[PDB]
């Protein structure tokens, strides 16, 4: 959930309005570089799955 | 096991008219027999024959096979429809590269080639070419395999050299050796009983195959084929392929795909780094103590890892499954 | 229009495949069907087919 | 904006430089098939949005 | 380099006298080469008494 809502609610999507790194940083205590940092962890995951990988092209 | 009479069938006299031409006669043979046979062979032998045909021609300044050179009367695609009929007989190798060096006013025949000790030309008589000044010179290095039955180049679209330099020429293959096949029934004067019958095949070939091992082979082939009609178990295919990769399809493919320079190409392909499943999963630590491997190399890696998406060093003790 | 432009002559060989409308001389159209092995047609009391 | 006739396609592979040249039209006398490029060209287009 | 053998082999006896065989992987005119062959042998060179 800290991970889904980062990652959906950063680059915007299902919820219209996307925030920056500030309004979602208020809004889970942590400011900025702690958001950032699981920001990059949820891209690290998706590394294996193949599904968005041929999604691309 | 112990029923039915039957005869058997042997060899009489090959009549070699020519290098080409040839008859051979079957003479212990029943009646209904000699003209069953005649059809099987005539099959095999008009069909499923060996032989040799020229797939693959690269000469020199000349590109595509539509163009000319000067000093040269035919134009390319001639010459290339001439080497279609070459009566090559090669020793005991799959494919042979015949040089074919001749300068100077003159036809070039199949002769200019250069003589190989294990090529044996037929006809060397055989037109290729036709120089006409003086000053004119060619050279072209051809292409001869073993194989059966026509495929032209039209077959293989990209399916040989993924490189394929822009010089080489892909001509089609006739392979079969048997120009034409036929065959009499004919009484047979067997001096022994009264109503047998002797299947004479006249035979038409180009000379770079006997009629010995011709019709060996040909009948061989309908043996090798009759012993699948002896048992009857029914064999059935297990199918049931497994659809569920455990791991991205791209870990699958070689690091030639990553598109890197060449000095980087060469040190994966020595240090025993093939597939991508071994770059993903090998360290920066690693990385160093390779040959030839600077800091200009290492960053191109992991830009062109990265890229795709992919990262450098990752695990995945799953490698590989599971054929 | 606009610019520079690249016309790319590409020349193809085509066989004749099933389905070519051939004809003769004397109003005889016709299509071809299948292809057909040597080793299965009409042939004489020589090796000569059709 | 103009749209220039380059070898900078994007989302290619191997492929291209394969059969184009440094500048994006393929070598005369080579083979190509069904997909291949001829001429590299491309549009200027940004927004998407996304 | 030789040639292949036929795999799928798929036997139907409609009773015990009259039944269908059907072999399926076989090269050009070879099924039909077996067919004159087999059909020539089991219409005359067979045994049995009458």
């Known amino acids: 959930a800290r991970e889904a809502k980062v990652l959906r609610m950063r680059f915007g999507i299902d919820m219209n309005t996307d925030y920056t790194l500030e309004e979602v940083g208020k809004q889970f205590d942590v400011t900025r570089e702690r958001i950032r940092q699981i920001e990059a962890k949820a891209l690290r995951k998706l590394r294996h799955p193949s599904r968005s990988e041929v999604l691309r092209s | 096991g112990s029923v039915t009479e039957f005869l058997k069938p042997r060899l009489v006299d090959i009549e070699q008219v020519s290098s080409t031409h040839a008859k051979v006669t079957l003479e212990p043979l029943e009646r209904g027999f000699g003209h069953t046979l005649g059809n099987a062979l005539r099959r095999i032998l008009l069909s499923s024959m060996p032989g040799c045909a020229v797939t693959e021609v690269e000469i020199d300044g000349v590109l595509h096979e539509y163009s000319t050179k000067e000093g040269v009367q035919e134009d390319i695609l001639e010459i290339l429809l001439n080497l279609k009929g070459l009566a090559v007989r090669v020793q005991g190798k799959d494919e042979v590269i015949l040089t074919l060096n001749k300068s100077g006013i003159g036809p070039v025949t199949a002769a200019d080639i250069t003589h190989d000790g294990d090529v044996e030309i037929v006809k060397p008589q055989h037109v290729i070419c036709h120089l006409t000044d003086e000053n004119a010179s060619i050279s072209m290095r051809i292409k001869v395999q073993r194989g059966r039955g026509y495929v032209p180049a039209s077959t293989r679209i990209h399916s040989e050299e993924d490189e394929r330099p822009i010089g080489r020429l892909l001509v089609d293959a006739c392979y079969s050796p048997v120009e034409r096949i036929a065959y009499n029934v004919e009484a047979a004067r067997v001096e022994q009983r009264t109503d047998l019958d002797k299947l004479v095949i006249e035979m038409e070939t180009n000379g770079t195959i006997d009629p010995e091992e011709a019709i060996r082979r040909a009948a061989t082939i309908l043996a090798e084929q009759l012993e699948a009609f002896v048992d009857l178990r029914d064999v059935r295919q297990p199918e049931v392929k497994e659809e569920k990769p455990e791991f991205d399809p791209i870990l699958l493919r070689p690091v030639d795909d990553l598109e890197l320079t060449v000095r980087s190409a060469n040190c994966l392909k020595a240090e025993a780094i093939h597939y991508i499943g071994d770059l993903v999963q090998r360290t920066e630590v690693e990385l160093l103590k390779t040959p030839n491997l600077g800091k200009k190399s290492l960053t191109e890696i992991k830009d062109v890892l990265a890229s795709r998406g992919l990262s450098l060093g990752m695990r995945l003790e799953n490698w590989p499954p599971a054929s | ?50 | 904006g103009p749209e220039e006739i380059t070898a900078d396609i994007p989302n290619v592979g191997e492929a291209a430089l394969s059969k184009l040249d440094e500048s994006g039209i393929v070598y005369i006398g080579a083979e190509v098939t069904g997909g291949d490029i001829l001429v590299g060209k491309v549009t200027p287009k940004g927004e998407t949005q996304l």
Do not use: C, F, W
Not at chain 3, 29 to 49: A, C, F, L, R
């Open chain 3, 1 to 50: 229009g606009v610019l520079k432009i690249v016309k790319v002559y590409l020349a193809v060989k085509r066989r004749i495949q099933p389905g070519d409308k051939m004809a003769g001389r004397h109003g005889n159209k016709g299509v071809i069907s299948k292809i057909n092995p040597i080793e299965d047609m009409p042939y004489d009391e020589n090796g000569t087919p059709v």
